[PDB]
A paper describes a structure:
Like in case of Sb1, the interaction of Sb3 with LRRC8A has stabilized the cytoplasmic LRR domains and thus allowed a detailed structural characterization of its binding mode. Similar to Sb1, Sb2, and Sb3 both target individual LRRC8A subunits on the convex side of the LRR domain but, in contrast to former, they bind to a region that is located closer to the transmembrane domain. For complexes with Sb2 and Sb3, the interaction involves residues on repeats 3–6 on the LRR domain. In the well-defined interactions of the LRRC8A/Sb3 complex, 1495 Å2 of the combined molecular surface are buried by the sybody targeting the l-subunit and 1866 Å2 by the sybody targeting the r-subunit. In the LRRC8A/Sb3 complex, the structural rearrangements of the LRR domains are even more pronounced and they are also accompanied by changes of the pore. Whereas the conformation of the r-subunit resembles the LRRC8A/Sb2 complex, the enhanced (26°) reorientation of the LRR domain of the l-subunit results in its movement towards the membrane. The concurrent redistribution of interactions establishes contacts between repeats 10–16 of the l-domain and repeats 1–8 at the contacted r-domain, which bury 904 Å2 of the combined molecular surface. The described relocation of the LRR domains appears to be coupled to the pore where the interface between neighboring l- and r-domains is disrupted at the intracellular side and both domains are splayed open by an 8° rotation around an axis that is located close to the extracellular sub-domain, which remains unchanged in both structures. The resulting dissociation of contacts results in a pronounced gap at the intracellular side. Conversely, the low currents of LRRC8A were further attenuated upon coexpression with the inhibitory sybody Sb3.
Numbering used by the authors:
A (entry chain D): 356 to 808
B (entry chain J): 1 to 120
C (entry chain D): 153 to 176, 230 to 254
D (entry chain D): 15 to 51
E (entry chain E): 153 to 176
The structure:
């Protein structure tokens, strides 16, 4: 049978079971041949695949289709023995997520899918045939893979010439090499987003070279030390520079030359001083300077020099006071300084009529300036765990305000004027139930009437 | 078939120049990324030279910056690597490598046999 | 002997054996479940005998 | 009734030889009982 | 005795006994 059925994975039969097989063969080999198909792992795997296809019908997967963060159809396969053949009939699928699928082979039937753009290989080593690999080389945008060993990553990852986003969340640090595993990353000329997470010690030379055409570089070392040493000066078109948990301990000196940057995030880098805003003046297009989850004693005066700030983030820091020069920036919209040792906000905040979202959570803010409420373009204000004794009645003049939070405050009075707003619902204004009763009910009943839809 | 074969192996004392080469079978060299790696006894493979596909741009490791010269010759369908008075500490076994040629089958990366160059 | 004969006759009259030998177009769910149960039965018989 | 698959040709032959030996045993026995003078 | 034999025969070739043993 092994020389005829081409199934060499039929183990030899031991004593007390080879004897009866020999007797049956002495009767006729037909029974032995028909029985041997239940001793081969290949037939067992084929039966598993067929039962998976029959059990996971097209309708069940279609109903299981979900929408991801980017608002597109996504299918999640977790711990399945394989990919059902009915899955590759979902031409409307756009993202295919595979997690903990053993010995997965991507069949040529993936070409039947046309809207597929992202492939998620979570701890799955996928082996792909030529017709399917050509389709992936032509019709795959992003590739997310998680792994523990360098060898269990696909070897055809560098063959995806149309790839745009690459997400590595493994451990690329091999044995005494400068990340030779990804030395083929230079092949990808269409790469736009890189999402390395391997606890980098020295930034790979291949990544520094390939970043000359990279848009969003996001790195996470989980607090592992990373040294730059004039590595980003080669890039000229980088816009996002997330370096969350990279243990830089300081803002790198090579980030100044990246004038094209617009988003910078250095969360959990254990920074000490951010006086480098004076050197940051090169970046005229910077609008999303993020530095939260860090430890900075105070905000330097050089923030006011930059006037293009729109997304300012210093949350979960220990900053005792806000210098008045920071308020010079007239285009802040997503300013959030939460979980900070603040005592009060200067009245210069009221000159920022362009503010949309503000978070002053976990701040010892006794009161707010009436000049702050004079702006009319506010959208959301999160105020959690703040020592507030009263709320000014002038907030009722806010019409564009969509939502506010007063949870954790030591409040006992809510102005009646707060209920006069064109846009006001239960979801937007959530406060303590006892404090909710201090307003007259004739407006609450009308609000509840319109809360349906 | 697809395979790489290189030559030029020979023990050369410090003070001269050695001209390496390669030979690609089954695929054009212009539409492919060619790499040069080095191997040493008791040491893991280290990247040396890379020439990019679709634009022919050279890439060197920080250890070998500004000393080697790599070129692609489509007439012979080969890649030429030339050093400049290589040090005895650079004595190693050089490996050719091209990954993900236009043909996409199970072997995605192809390596040469390997040539040992000795400097003392 | 009777266990071996029962297993051999179950594997002999299994339609999945016919399909496997004819491999060289839809299958019933119950047939696949029975084939999986027969595979498990053969494994238990082999480890017992 | 599926017991014949475990009986090879030699077992069937021995069964038939045993039947014939039993027949000659019965013949000799009835001869030695009825007429052994 | 006959009830025990019938029950044992049912339990021996029951379709769920194989599943229970495979789970172990």
């Amino acid at each position: 049978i092994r020389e005829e059925s081409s199934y060499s994975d039929i183990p030899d039969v031991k004593n007390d079971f080879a004897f009866m097989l020999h007797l049956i063969d002495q009767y006729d080999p037909l029974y032995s041949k028909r029985f041997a198909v239940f001793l081969s792992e290949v037939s067992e795997n084929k039966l598993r695949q067929l039962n998976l296809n029959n059990e996971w019908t097209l309708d069940k997967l279609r109903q299981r289709l979900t929408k991801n963060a980017q608002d597109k159809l996504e299918l999640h396969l977790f711990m399945l023995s394989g990919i059902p053949d009915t899955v590759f009939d979902l031409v409307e699928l756009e993202v295919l997520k595979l997690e903990l699928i053993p010995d997965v082979t991507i069949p040529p039937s993936i070409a039947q899918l046309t809207g597929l753009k992202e492939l998620w290989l979570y701890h799955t080593a996928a082996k792909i045939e030529a017709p399917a690999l050509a389709f992936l080389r032509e019709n795959l945008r992003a590739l997310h893979i998680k792994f523990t060993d360098i060898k269990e990553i696909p070897l055809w990852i560098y063959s995806l010439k149309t790839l745009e986003e690459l997400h590595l969340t493994g451990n690329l640090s091999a044995e005494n090499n400068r990340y030779i595993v990804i030395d083929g990353l230079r092949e990808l000329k269409r790469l736009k987003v890189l999402r390395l997470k391997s606890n980098l010690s020295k930034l790979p030379q291949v990544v520094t070279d390939v970043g000359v055409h990279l848009q969003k570089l996001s790195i996470n070392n989980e607090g592992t030390k990373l040294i730059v040493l004039n590595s980003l000066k080669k890039m000229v078109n980088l816009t996002e520079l997330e370096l969350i948990r990279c243990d830089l301990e300081r803002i790198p000196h090579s980030i100044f030359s990246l004038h094209n940057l617009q988003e910078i995030d250095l969360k959990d880098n254990n920074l000490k001083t951010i006086e480098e805003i004076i050197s940051f003046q090169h970046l005229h297009r910077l609008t999303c300077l993020k530095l939260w989850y860090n430890h900075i004693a105070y905000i330097p005066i050089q923030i006011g020099n930059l006037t293009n700030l729109e997304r300012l983030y210093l949350n979960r820091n220990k900053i005792e006071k806000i210098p008045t020069q920071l308020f010079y920036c007239r285009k802040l919209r997503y300013l959030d300084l939460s979980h900070n040792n603040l005592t009060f906000l200067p009245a210069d905040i009221g000159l920022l009529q362009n503010l949309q979202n503000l978070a002053v959570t976990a701040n010892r803010i006794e009161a707010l300036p009436p000049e702050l409420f004079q702006c009319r373009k506010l959208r959301a204000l999160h105020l959690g765990n703040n020592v507030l004794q009263s709320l000014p009645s002038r907030v009722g003049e806010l019409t564009n305000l969509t939502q506010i939070e007063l949870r954790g405050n030591r409040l006992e009075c809510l102005p009646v004027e707060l209920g006069e707003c064109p846009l006001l619902k239960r979801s937007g204004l959530v406060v303590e139930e006892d404090l909710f009763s201090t307003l007259p009910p004739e407006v609450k009943e009308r609000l509840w009437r319109a809360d349906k839809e | 078939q697809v395979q790489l074969v290189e030559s030029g192996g020979g023990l050369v004392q410090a003070g001269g120049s050695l001209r390496l080469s390669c030979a690609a079978s089954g695929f054009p060299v212009m539409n492919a990324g060619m790499y040069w790696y080095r191997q040493a006894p008791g040491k893991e493979r280290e990247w040396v030279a890379a020439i990019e596909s679709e634009g022919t741009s050279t890439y060197y490791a920080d250890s070998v910056k500004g000393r080697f010269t790599i070129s692609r010759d489509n007439a012979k369908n080969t890649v030429y690597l030339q050093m400049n008075s290589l040090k005895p500490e650079d004595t190693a076994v050089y490996y050719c490598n091209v990954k993900d040629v236009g043909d996409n089958h199970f072997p995605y990366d192809y390596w040469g046999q390997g040539t040992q160059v000795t400097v003392s | 002997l009777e266990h071996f004969v029962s297993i051999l006759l179950k594997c002999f009259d299994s339609p999945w054996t016919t399909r496997a030998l004819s491999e060289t177009g839809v299958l019933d769910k119950k047939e696949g479940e029975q084939a999986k149960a027969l595979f498990e039965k053969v494994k238990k018989f082999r480890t017992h005998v | 009734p599926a017991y014949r698959i475990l009986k090879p040709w030699w077992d069937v032959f021995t069964d038939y030889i045993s039947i014939v030996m039993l027949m000659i045993a019965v013949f000799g026995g009835t001869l030695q009982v009825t007429q052994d003078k």
